[PDB]
Amino acid sequence: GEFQRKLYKELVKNYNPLERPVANDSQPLTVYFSLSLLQIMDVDEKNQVLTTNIWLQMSWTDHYLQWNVSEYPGVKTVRFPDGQIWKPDILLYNSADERFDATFHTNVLVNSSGHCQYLPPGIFKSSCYIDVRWFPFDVQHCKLKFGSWSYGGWSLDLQMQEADISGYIPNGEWDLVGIPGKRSERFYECCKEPYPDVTFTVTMRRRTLYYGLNLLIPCVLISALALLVFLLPADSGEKISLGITVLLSLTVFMLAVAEIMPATSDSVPLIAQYFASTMIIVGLSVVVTVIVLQYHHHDPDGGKMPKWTRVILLNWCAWFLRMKRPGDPDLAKILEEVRYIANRFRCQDESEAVCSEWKFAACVVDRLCLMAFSVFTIICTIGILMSAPNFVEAVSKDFA
Amino acid sequence: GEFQRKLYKELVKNYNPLERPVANDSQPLTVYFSLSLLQIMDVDEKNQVLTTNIWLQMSWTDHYLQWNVSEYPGVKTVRFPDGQIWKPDILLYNSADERFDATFHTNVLVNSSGHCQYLPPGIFKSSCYIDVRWFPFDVQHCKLKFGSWSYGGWSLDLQMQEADISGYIPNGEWDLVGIPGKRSERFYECCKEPYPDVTFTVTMRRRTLYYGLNLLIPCVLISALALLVFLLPADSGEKISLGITVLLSLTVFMLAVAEIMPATSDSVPLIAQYFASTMIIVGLSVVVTVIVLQYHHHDPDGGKMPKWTRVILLNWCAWFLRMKRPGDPDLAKILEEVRYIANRFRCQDESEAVCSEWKFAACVVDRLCLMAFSVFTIICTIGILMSAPNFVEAVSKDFA
Amino acid sequence: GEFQRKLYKELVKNYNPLERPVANDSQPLTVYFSLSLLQIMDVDEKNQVLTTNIWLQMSWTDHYLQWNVSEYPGVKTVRFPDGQIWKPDILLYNSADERFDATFHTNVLVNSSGHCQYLPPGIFKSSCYIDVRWFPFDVQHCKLKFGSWSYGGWSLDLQMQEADISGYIPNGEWDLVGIPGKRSERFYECCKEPYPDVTFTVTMRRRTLYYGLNLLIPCVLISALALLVFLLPADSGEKISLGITVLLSLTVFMLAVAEIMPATSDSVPLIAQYFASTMIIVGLSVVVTVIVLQYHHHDPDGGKMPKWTRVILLNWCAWFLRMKRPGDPDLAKILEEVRYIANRFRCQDESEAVCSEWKFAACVVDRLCLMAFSVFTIICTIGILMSAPNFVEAVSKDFA
Amino acid sequence: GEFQRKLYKELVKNYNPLERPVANDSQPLTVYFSLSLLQIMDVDEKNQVLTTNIWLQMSWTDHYLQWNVSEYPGVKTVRFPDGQIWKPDILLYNSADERFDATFHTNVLVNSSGHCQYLPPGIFKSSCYIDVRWFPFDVQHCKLKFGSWSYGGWSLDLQMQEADISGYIPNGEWDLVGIPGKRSERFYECCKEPYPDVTFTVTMRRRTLYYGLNLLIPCVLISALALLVFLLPADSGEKISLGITVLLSLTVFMLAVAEIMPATSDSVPLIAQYFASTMIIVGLSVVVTVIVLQYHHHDPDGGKMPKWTRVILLNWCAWFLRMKRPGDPDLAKILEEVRYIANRFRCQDESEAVCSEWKFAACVVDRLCLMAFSVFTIICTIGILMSAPNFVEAVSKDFA
Amino acid sequence: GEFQRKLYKELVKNYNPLERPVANDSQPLTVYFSLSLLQIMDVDEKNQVLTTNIWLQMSWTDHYLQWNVSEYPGVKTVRFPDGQIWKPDILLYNSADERFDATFHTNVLVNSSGHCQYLPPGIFKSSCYIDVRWFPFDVQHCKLKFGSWSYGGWSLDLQMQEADISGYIPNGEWDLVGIPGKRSERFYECCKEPYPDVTFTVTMRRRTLYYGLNLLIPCVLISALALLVFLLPADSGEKISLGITVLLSLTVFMLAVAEIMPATSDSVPLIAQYFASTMIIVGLSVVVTVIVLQYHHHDPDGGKMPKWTRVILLNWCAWFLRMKRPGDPDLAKILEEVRYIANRFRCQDESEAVCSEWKFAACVVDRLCLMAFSVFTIICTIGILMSAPNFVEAVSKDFA
Ligand SMILES: CN1CCC[C@H]1c1cccnc1
Ligand SMILES: CN1CCC[C@H]1c1cccnc1
Ligand SMILES: CN1CCC[C@H]1c1cccnc1
Ligand SMILES: CN1CCC[C@H]1c1cccnc1
């Protein structure tokens, strides 16, 4: 329209985009900075980066971009692109994006009274410290730090407004707790001018249903299946195969899991302690199986059992476990021949009885160690999962 | 030509690219926005992003870009590049691209009567929520939201035109159901001006031939092969090897499959429930194999078989399964010695008969558990695959 | 020089880069579009993208960029950068590149008679449909679609010149069959003006030496090694171990291979059918092994063999395979005692003979199934590899 | 304000951004270059690149950007964007980034006396040589080299200021030792003008907790578990299964670990020597197990054991290990028949005794080799981890 | 300075950046092109791309950028940025970078006599053909082709200068042999003007320490460990387990290695032939193990050992290997019963002797095949490693 064309022609006249738009130079310019979180697109524990889709919200009063609506009846707002009117250079301080500024420079709306608006979208990559000590039951506080890059306190009086999450779309992995902000004033070694900033802390809680179903449950099942070695009879040579192939499967699983975790050394992750406990339990099960097979394939001629181990393993554990404890010259010379055969058979029977007693001792050791291992693994897993704080509320919110 | 050069020289004179091209400022400018889907290049279930190749279509009437063809005999249309004539700043709201605007700014055609056209191509990355609950038999509704960024209802009267899929090239993985649109008016906390938008919902159905052939069928085959442990005779100490190696192979398969799935916690994926069922079946088969081997290698001196289990496992299951149930002083002193040898042989035969009865009990348990496991596996797989809606039509469209 | 400086000063005078350089506006401008393929740097079967290094070739006549060499003795050509003289906006329609235009805008040569040249290089990512039905013996026809984006038939009369492959450097994976093209005229729903285009079809044949050596040969070898179970005597407890560890190795191999193939559902890949055949063969090998072990470890007291299976497996298969078929009162009291011992030995010998006959039946079953499985594997692999068209010429060109 | 607008209008007048801002052309311009490290975001051992988030700090005196505050009462500092005032072209020489300059060009503050400030942020990818010889106990010295690209010693007198690490945020993997620098003057083959530069050496020590917990400890555990083959009795045919499955698990572990190390050939990494030692230990354990099984399954009819090995293995090793060393015509016809049976039994017993002696020799060899292997593996691991310098202080700082 | 400002103001006056800076238009402009290699940052065998960090060096005489130092006492050189003075459009022809030009356009120094310098840095991605036939002992000749894109021979007389490698930093993987260049003149189909170019061949030799320590040595070790199956006594059912687990480990290793090689079909890589030999050796070892177990578990009643195999395997191989070759009515009725028992024992002894002879034949076959396999493996590995040229000098340079 003619009025809009005239207004645009007269508005840009004698206008310097570099100049700070204030009537009095000494007075600082008030800028209201806010944020509009839309989606936590991705968080990278390994890379310690947080990818978010947010809309920055900036607003300030421009002294030069004013006009009377009476002379321009139809024109109420005007929009200027990048590089034609003054804009605050508000950057994300802790940015992990290859280009330090990830905003998409859009137009700037202008009141009929000089008030300006600026909502540049963009996907921000911020380097936030991520705790995996309580993985997967961890809550994260990733900070977004915004502030003017080259204007100080006396120039650009930055002000905070509450972050808006009305348009936030829920993420399938992270539950948002809140996004509070805090306005802080910080000095710098360059200059004697404070540089105010606005810091937004994105507190988000990880939803642990997928991790509990795909990481914790399979390890519980495989560890419990490793205890089956203590039910296999030793006569079938499959105990070591069972134990060691279970160990190999656990090795593959733990390798795949560790493929996705940060190489941080601040503390031992909860899942790392859990996997260490499972590995130790399986290894000690294999060691006990080796001991049991030593006690089972014990040659009777090797030597008599020690009295102490004999009495304890055949009395105390049996009482505890309620196990059942098993149990003319030609004529004379033929007689002595049959005597040799019969005595050989009797000696064979005695050796067989000794070996059977050794086998029973192996079985008793096996059963007692099965009970001990089952109790220990249950107690250890329960304790490890109890140790994580907010674990009960994570369970209540996800599973229940 | 001379006429075209004169027209270009005169048309740009006193033209402001910022001004909205309307004759009456109060009246809003009508913009007809459409879309031309060409190809669904990629969808990322893990990243919850949808990559599409589309041509945006905008059209509006420009009051200033008008001329009489009589004075320019050969010139019917003119073309302006980016930044020289007014263009709507129609952006994809839910964009997951590193740069928020993925369009390639092309030329802009103009009528001889002022009507304008604008078809900027580009590959758009939009963050759409992806449901894996019914994976791989899921239908996806990924939304594309377009609307002016700085112009409200009273400024840019955005309108919807039906999406064009004439040039759409079929994708090898996803079957397009449709791309309907909906024009909605939404308020914002910034301003008291409604901002109309156009939302296109891309309804896509996944073609399940590849997934059924490469994920489901191998699991059915391996789970069925795990049941072979219940046909191996216990004498060959290989049952545990069979079952455990099958479990390890399934572990590798499920790990590789889960490598491609999003870490969402809204619901348990169908294939996740299926894998859980297969893992449980294999583990229970291994447990039953351990019990069977306990029954097989039962020492006759350990104790008499309990009356209840004896009667049930030797009468009821045998009747059910129709199994066959098997079955001077020198002379006298030599006599008593040969009596000893024969009595030893008779006791050995009695112990052998008891052990054989134990072995038959183990075989009966093994056979009945084979039948139970086969029936349970078939029923569970059929039910899980039935639970997915549109499974029947997916099968009919893909396989048949 | 002075002449060149004067020519450049006078040439740009009253020159509009937007204007189409024609003397008569009504007549269209003839543009000769060609292409110079140099290297097929990459083709992504999984992503359905083709990455090529090509030089576009454009040529047209400028009415305004003309001068007389007499007044400029030294100057024969002039060069203009991007954005200073008119250039056709010829884009790759089916572009899968993040930026829709991948050309590198270079200088533009000009005749002394107005003729123009333009050879912008660039690496083009085009989305071409890729058939893996005959993989790895497949030939691919990936299309490149070029045409003016905003000029119609009456404005830019696009013409075609044959593609140049003189400078093409051979690829180590793909053998170029040819790059023919076709110039087509297509209408659009926007406008009543046809838009001519030039489509180049890149027909390339995959060289199958690497794939045959690294995928097909190892699977033949592993499948053949799986048949060794039918030579292992059943006395050594290793048959299921062999079969199932071969199955696990094939599982790893097929997983690694399937990691590289697209998730298309148009048809079952040839290598997919081949792997399915190998998996079925190994699975049935394990099943037959379980059957043979059932036959081998058959208790003699379990029951007499069925007459039909006895006669067939001990006569017909033996004849076929030419197998060798194996085979005072004290005196009376001692008499009856030794009679008992010898009768027990005779019964033991009878049971041993029955069990040995069962073992021979198992051996005969094993041998006949070995012959059947070897024949079936050879026939199936030969048929599957024969089914692929141009397989014989692929072999002749690669191996021979 | 009016004063700010007048100052900006008058300051840019007759200003040339290309000109070096010095009053006397002959005198060089002093530029103070510093650095502000904030975070070592990522280091890539495989790619030999270091990714850091740093703020360059440059400052110089501009002769033309001076004004009297008396005439501009409110204006104390002014800010210019990129391309409008002279800036030093200080580039990172050893840059491994796709674009050689990774800085984000921000504004430049200016004193009321001409002093200028410039703190452009950016994420810098520098190619630093990385030593993996002492991995994971290595300390890295990655260099950052900065200097003017086109200004020599007589033009831009580059000067140094100490690097600032007040704002440094600790990294979860690398402990910063310090960031000292050195200012060096270097000639070039192009020109006879020295080019001063500022080189900052980023000395960082790797925190070892995660690597020791996830790489070293599992290898210790698996190697120790491989020694259990020397406790399993040879009667249970599971020794080779144990050894070879442990070897396969170690193969998987070493493959996964070697996936993350560079293909560096200056020296053998410490973890590489460690894995080589573990592989040798496991392989030699398998070889010794094969020898032990040869000794155990020695047919008595094969031949008498050599006198030398007999005496040593049954006297010296027994003394060392304190092992218990185990241990009418009708009447005549029946007579000689029973004589035959008893003589057969006696010969059988003699052969059994010889085989038992062979088995005891195998057991003694097995035990002595167990002791030798345990001692050797402990000594080798201890020595390898001792060989790394600063290992003790790394352990003290991380674990303790 | 005032002199510098005046010089810059006067120099740009009547200066056209498009014009070629020559006094006489007819004579070509001489441009001296060189290169300064700094680091071979990365080479991609799979992608056939070479990533280098180089500084292009260009120099030419500008007729217009001349001044007398007498009138400008302090000004000796001036610097112009991109787009303000003429620069050769020298591009890397065989560029594989997404943007065809990877240079970073820096400033451009100028003499006081008109001579000009230009050293743009940048990381260049070039598509160079990579031979993996002799991998890992291969030497690579990757070409970099530079030349003016738009200027021909009569316009821009491109000239060569020797490449500079004084600042080259050694790479941890590739040993640089040299970077010779060659200036060639090549015609094009577009134009009748030759286009001179400068081609630099980067000859680099791969350092084989890491590859020989992580790829070759483990394969030698695993292949040698596969031969242990020929020392295991057949009585312990672990031969097939050993051989097949070794084969599975080799499968995993070869899959991981083949993950990193190009899918080229020009020729079979040396490491591929090596892996084929190892796989064949292991598979044939498994086949021979199956044959040995057939010979060992040969029932005596199947049939007499054939005369030919009997004589050869019990005489010739025994002589070769020097193996030890092992070895009233009541009375009469009781008599005949004991005769039956004794005859049964004698027949059992004869069958045992026949079985022992079969076992000895199996042992003889096993030992001879062990010797054959060891010799064949050593010979094949030595020959394959010898076949690669420059292998001896690669070993001398890396290991020694
Ligand atoms: C607060 N600003 C942003 C970081 C440092 C500081 C600053 C100070 C002076 C010039 N540039 C930047
Ligand atoms: C609808 N627009 C796009 C998102 C917010 C809104 C807006 C309003 C005012 C200034 N910028 C953006
Ligand atoms: C052929 N052109 C390229 C694709 C669509 C078509 C077109 C028509 C009108 C305006 N822009 C584009
Ligand atoms: C040598 N130049 C580079 C490749 C082709 C040739 C050329 C010729 C004319 C116009 N542009 C490029």
Side-chain angles (χ1 to χ4, degrees), chain B residues 12-188 190-191 193-294:
Chain B
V12 186
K13 185 186 311 165
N14 277 333
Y15 185 77
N16 206 337
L18 306 181
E19 163 192 14
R20 219 177 73 255
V22 308
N24 200 2
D25 289 327
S26 66
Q27 258 76 7
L29 179 72
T30 303
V31 169
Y32 299 101
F33 179 81
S34 174
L35 189 141
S36 170
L37 176 71
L38 290 181
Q39 183 182 5
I40 302 160
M41 290 147 38
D42 190 313
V43 70
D44 229 358
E45 287 109 353
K46 177 170 278 295
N47 288 310
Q48 314 265 285
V49 85
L50 162 74
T51 307
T52 50
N53 187 330
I54 58 198
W55 295 345
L56 306 186
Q57 301 201 24
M58 302 146 233
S59 165
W60 64 95
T61 305
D62 199 310
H63 171 72
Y64 301 115
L65 272 52
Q66 302 192 356
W67 70 88
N68 197 8
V69 182
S70 294
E71 284 81 2
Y72 312 93
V75 193
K76 284 177 173 334
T77 53
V78 296
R79 290 140 201 101
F80 285 94
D82 181 321
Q84 292 183 358
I85 59 145
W86 180 91
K87 293 192 292 184
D89 45 352
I90 292 182
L91 275 68
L92 172 70
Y93 279 51
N94 54 293
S95 188
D97 196 348
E98 291 306 301
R99 330 152 302 143
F100 214 56
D101 207 350
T103 64
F104 179 75
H105 302 258
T106 55
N107 297 8
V108 170
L109 302 76
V110 176
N111 252 1
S112 65
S113 80
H115 184 258
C116 158
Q117 268 163 275
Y118 184 41
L119 276 94
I123 279 143
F124 290 69
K125 284 193 251 293
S126 57
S127 70
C128 69
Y129 164 79
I130 281 169
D131 247 3
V132 288
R133 165 81 178 89
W134 296 134
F135 179 88
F137 309 96
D138 53 341
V139 58
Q140 296 299 6
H141 311 80
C142 288
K143 289 184 181 292
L144 299 161
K145 189 171 151 168
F146 296 99
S148 184
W149 199 263
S150 320
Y151 297 88
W154 338 116
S155 284
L156 191 136
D157 181 21
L158 198 62
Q159 293 292 345
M160 157 152 141
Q161 268 184 353
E162 274 317 309
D164 176 6
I165 46 166
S166 66
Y168 175 63
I169 59 170
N171 197 9
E173 181 173 358
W174 292 87
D175 164 11
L176 191 81
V177 156
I179 177 161
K182 194 176 77 75
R183 188 248 195 204
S184 56
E185 201 149 9
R186 174 151 141 81
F187 277 79
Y188 284 89
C190 78
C191 324
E193 187 174 8
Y195 284 85
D197 72 1
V198 169
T199 312
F200 285 112
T201 316
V202 189
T203 311
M204 24 184 49
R205 192 201 50 104
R206 190 202 299 273
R207 305 172 86 180
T208 81
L209 173 54
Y210 160 87
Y211 286 85
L213 210 74
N214 294 56
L215 267 51
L216 305 178
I217 288 303
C219 284
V220 197
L221 291 210
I222 298 298
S223 147
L225 194 141
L227 275 36
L228 283 192
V229 175
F230 304 124
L231 291 172
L232 266 171
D235 307 59
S236 75
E238 270 179 61
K239 293 157 88 69
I240 302 281
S241 295
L242 179 44
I244 272 289
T245 317
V246 165
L247 167 143
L248 163 64
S249 174
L250 274 177
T251 289
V252 174
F253 191 79
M254 62 145 268
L255 244 190
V257 156
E259 90 185 342
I260 85 189
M261 202 95 67
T264 201
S265 309
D266 318 68
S267 57
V268 184
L270 182 135
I271 194 164
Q273 323 172 234
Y274 174 110
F275 286 175
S277 85
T278 312
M279 281 335 288
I280 271 46
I281 278 153
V282 171
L284 290 200
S285 81
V286 172
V287 175
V288 164
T289 298
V290 168
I291 296 169
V292 162
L293 291 177
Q294 279 191 352

Side-chain angles (χ1 to χ4, degrees), chain A residues 290-303 305-306 309-321 323 325:
Chain A
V290 168
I291 295 169
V292 167
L293 291 178
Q294 280 191 173
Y295 261 100
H296 177 91
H297 304 116
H298 196 273
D299 42 357
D301 302 332
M305 201 155 38
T309 181
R310 153 163 266 285
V311 58
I312 87 163
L313 274 181
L314 303 192
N315 289 141
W316 293 346
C317 295
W319 191 356
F320 181 165
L321 271 300
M323 294 224 157
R325 162 78 252 184

Side-chain angles (χ1 to χ4, degrees), chain E residues 69-188 190-191 193-297:
Chain E
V69 177
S70 293
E71 284 80 2
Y72 312 93
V75 195
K76 285 177 173 333
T77 52
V78 295
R79 290 141 205 100
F80 287 94
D82 190 324
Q84 281 174 357
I85 60 170
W86 180 91
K87 293 192 293 184
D89 46 358
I90 284 170
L91 275 67
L92 172 70
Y93 280 53
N94 54 294
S95 189
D97 193 348
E98 171 47 0
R99 322 142 300 133
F100 197 80
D101 214 341
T103 63
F104 179 74
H105 302 258
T106 55
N107 298 8
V108 171
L109 301 93
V110 177
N111 252 1
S112 67
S113 85
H115 285 74
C116 181
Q117 269 164 276
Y118 183 40
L119 280 102
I123 280 141
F124 290 70
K125 305 217 188 86
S126 43
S127 57
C128 67
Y129 163 78
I130 281 167
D131 248 13
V132 284
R133 167 78 177 87
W134 295 134
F135 177 89
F137 309 96
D138 53 344
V139 58
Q140 296 299 5
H141 311 260
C142 285
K143 289 185 181 293
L144 301 159
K145 188 170 150 172
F146 296 99
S148 183
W149 196 261
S150 168
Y151 298 87
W154 329 117
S155 286
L156 185 140
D157 180 24
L158 198 63
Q159 292 291 346
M160 192 171 167
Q161 262 173 2
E162 275 316 309
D164 169 5
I165 47 185
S166 66
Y168 175 64
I169 61 170
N171 196 9
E173 177 163 7
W174 293 87
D175 162 9
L176 192 82
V177 152
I179 178 149
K182 194 176 77 75
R183 188 248 195 204
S184 56
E185 199 146 11
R186 151 136 195 203
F187 277 78
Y188 284 89
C190 72
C191 321
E193 188 174 6
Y195 282 88
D197 91 359
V198 167
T199 313
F200 284 112
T201 296
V202 190
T203 320
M204 33 176 188
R205 190 201 49 104
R206 190 202 300 274
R207 303 172 88 168
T208 88
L209 173 54
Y210 161 87
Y211 285 85
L213 215 76
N214 295 55
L215 268 51
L216 307 181
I217 284 302
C219 284
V220 194
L221 279 206
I222 299 301
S223 151
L225 193 140
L227 276 36
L228 284 192
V229 182
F230 301 124
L231 294 180
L232 264 166
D235 310 60
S236 76
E238 287 289 312
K239 293 158 87 68
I240 303 281
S241 294
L242 182 45
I244 282 290
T245 312
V246 170
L247 166 146
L248 165 61
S249 297
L250 274 178
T251 291
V252 174
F253 193 81
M254 81 87 78
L255 227 47
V257 153
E259 90 185 342
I260 78 184
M261 300 207 47
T264 206
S265 308
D266 283 298
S267 201
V268 185
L270 181 135
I271 193 165
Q273 325 178 234
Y274 184 110
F275 286 174
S277 69
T278 315
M279 280 333 167
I280 271 45
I281 278 152
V282 171
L284 295 214
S285 81
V286 172
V287 176
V288 172
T289 300
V290 168
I291 304 313
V292 164
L293 291 177
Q294 274 187 354
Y295 263 128
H296 184 88
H297 302 294

